[PDB]
């Protein structure tokens, strides 16, 4: 509740209620129009919950009950760490936006591993039922070897994930976004893919890279190049922005951190559009940033996303926004002549 609670307290409460299943199960049932097959899995609908809401994998099942077609947990760092001092998250209600600088507060790999192991066979059934699980990997603040942090994550949580996310676009960890550079990115992902390939086949996840919305045209070309060279399975586009677009009204607009929500929407859609084209439409993209409606989702899908995620809209509109986005997405697909989600992926480019 934006009234009583500060944002971080509201978030903890949200996670708690969601994990305890206290919310009613969604009434909207998914039509076959919403089904997507990508990353070696079936997704019953293309609307997922973005990393950062369930950082430690405490609410996964509550999130499916909420109606998401897939769930991404994380980011998870190898060792536990508390992240930045409070306050570190801020509401900009006049912008339908949020700024955060958590800094990878994480329970760490071991705790998350044990937590996911407790429901591992339950998740295997959910996945076969079209409800996949992603795990987002981060790096410890004081870590000396970034690649080794990610390698650890691949080894410990890779066996429990349908897909893994190499998060190299968080704005709240010194030096992390420079891992998006060509030489550094190639070296890092080579190591990550090696570790992933060393896992037993039924425990072998797709590997995706999550990139910033603040990249130069050169960064983007280089990333597409490396992605195609190493055979990375996909891209998550995008993380929060360190920019502050003209027009922000919120009093807290000059807080340090990453901006999410509606002011990020089109910046993120344009990044999807550019990455889809640079990768010739052969690399699956999960579109994320300021989705709050069916139209927002469909614009990202037409720009090239096969899947979409939201987080910040859930801050202003609560759980109903999930059904709303799915219902509108279906209505818009019919209106514009698409048989389903799959036919609309990349349609803007044709
Ligand atoms: C409070 C908060 C925490 C987040 N934490 C993470 C994170 O730990 N790892 C990550 O890859 N993205 C994180 N994100 C980014 C979201 O996953 C998403 O990329 C971004 O917020 C844009 O989507 P949105 O506008 O729907 O919120 C976080 C976002 C917010 C608002
Ligand atoms: C106004 C709603 O309260 C919030 O601000 C909320 S509300 C929310 N999701 C959420 C989840 C479950 C319930 C029952 C409700 Cl109701 C909301 N998440 C946040 C939040 C998350 C991260 C940072 C800040 C806030
Ligand atoms: O932990 C963070 O603060 C965080 C990570 C991330 O990937 N994106 C974000 O906006 N914040």
Curated annotation (Swiss-Prot):
The keyword Transcription regulation does not apply. Binds 1 FMN per subunit. Its EC number is 1.3.5.2. The keyword Plastid does not apply. It is a single-pass membrane protein. Substrate binds at residues 55, 100-104, 167-172, 239-240. GO terms for biological process: 'de novo' pyrimidine nucleobase biosynthetic process; 'de novo' UMP biosynthetic process; pyrimidine ribonucleotide biosynthetic process; UDP biosynthetic process. InterPro entries: Aldolase_TIM (IPR013785), DHO_dehydrogenase (IPR050074), Dihydroorotate_DH_2 (IPR005719), Dihydroorotate_DH_cat (IPR005720), Dihydroorotate_DH_CS (IPR001295). Pathway: Pyrimidine metabolism; UMP biosynthesis via de novo pathway; orotate from (S)-dihydroorotate (quinone route): step 1/1. The uncleaved transit peptide is required for mitochondrial targeting and proper membrane integration. It is an enzyme of class 1 (oxidoreductase). PANTHER family: DIHYDROOROTATE DEHYDROGENASE (QUINONE), MITOCHONDRIAL, DIHYDROOROTATE DEHYDROGENASE (QUINONE), MITOCHONDRIAL-RELATED. It is linked to Postaxial acrofacial dysostosis: An autosomal recessive syndrome characterized by severe micrognathia, cleft lip and/or palate, hypoplasia or aplasia of the posterior elements of the limbs, coloboma of the eyelids and supernumerary nipples. This is Dihydroorotate dehydrogenase (quinone), mitochondrial. It comes from Homo sapiens (Human).
